[PDB]
Design a protein around this ligand. Sequence first.
Ligand SMILES: Nc1nc2c(ncn2[C@@H]2O[C@H](COP(=O)(O)OP(=O)(O)NP(=O)(O)O)[C@@H](O)[C@H]2O)c(=O)[nH]1
Ligand SMILES: [Mg+2]
Ligand SMILES: [Mg+2]
Length: 167
Amino acid sequence: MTEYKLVVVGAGGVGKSALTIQLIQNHFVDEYDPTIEDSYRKQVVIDGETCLLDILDTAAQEEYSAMRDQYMRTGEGFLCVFAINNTKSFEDIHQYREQIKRVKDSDDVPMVLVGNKCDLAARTVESRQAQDLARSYGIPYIETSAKTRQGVEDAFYTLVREIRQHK
Ligand SMILES: Nc1nc2c(ncn2[C@@H]2O[C@H](COP(=O)(O)OP(=O)(O)NP(=O)(O)O)[C@@H](O)[C@H]2O)c(=O)[nH]1
Ligand SMILES: [Mg+2]
Ligand SMILES: [Mg+2]
């Protein structure tokens, strides 16, 4: 069946790991501690088709990762995550996108912009601002909470559909 290589990127603390674990966790382990970069597998049916998702949870740009360029080459679609209470993380999206362009040599790489931590009242990035940004790149914008689980499935499955539509 169809395998998708997905990569989760973004600034430190935005919830890259929390999102990934929320999607892929089977709850055998009650609380799972993800301190390192790692890969995780999830089998899912999307629009009638059984997909195997291979999901790479990455470190922020400021962290050293030897395989960084290679996993961006491998990656077929990217969740570009910022937190709605962290303006710097939203501003850093430009840099994550540029890194993906640098490696893959394309302006048309499948991506979804994800405003995480939407359960929090203390918002500093308005949804309209992020919609405008996503529209300028021709990518979807999805808000999520890794805590309440709102939007998590939508974010990842939307990314899969972007990859499929890119073909
Ligand atoms: N309120 C709230 N907190 C969240 C949400 N997602 C993650 N967090 C919290 O934000 C902190 C960072 O989460 P984490 O999953 O480690 O983020 P990360 O982007 O993987 N961090 P790192 O870059 O260090 O790997 C944790 O305290 C986590 O519980 C969310 O949707 N809502
Ligand atoms: Mg993490
Ligand atoms: Mg406000």
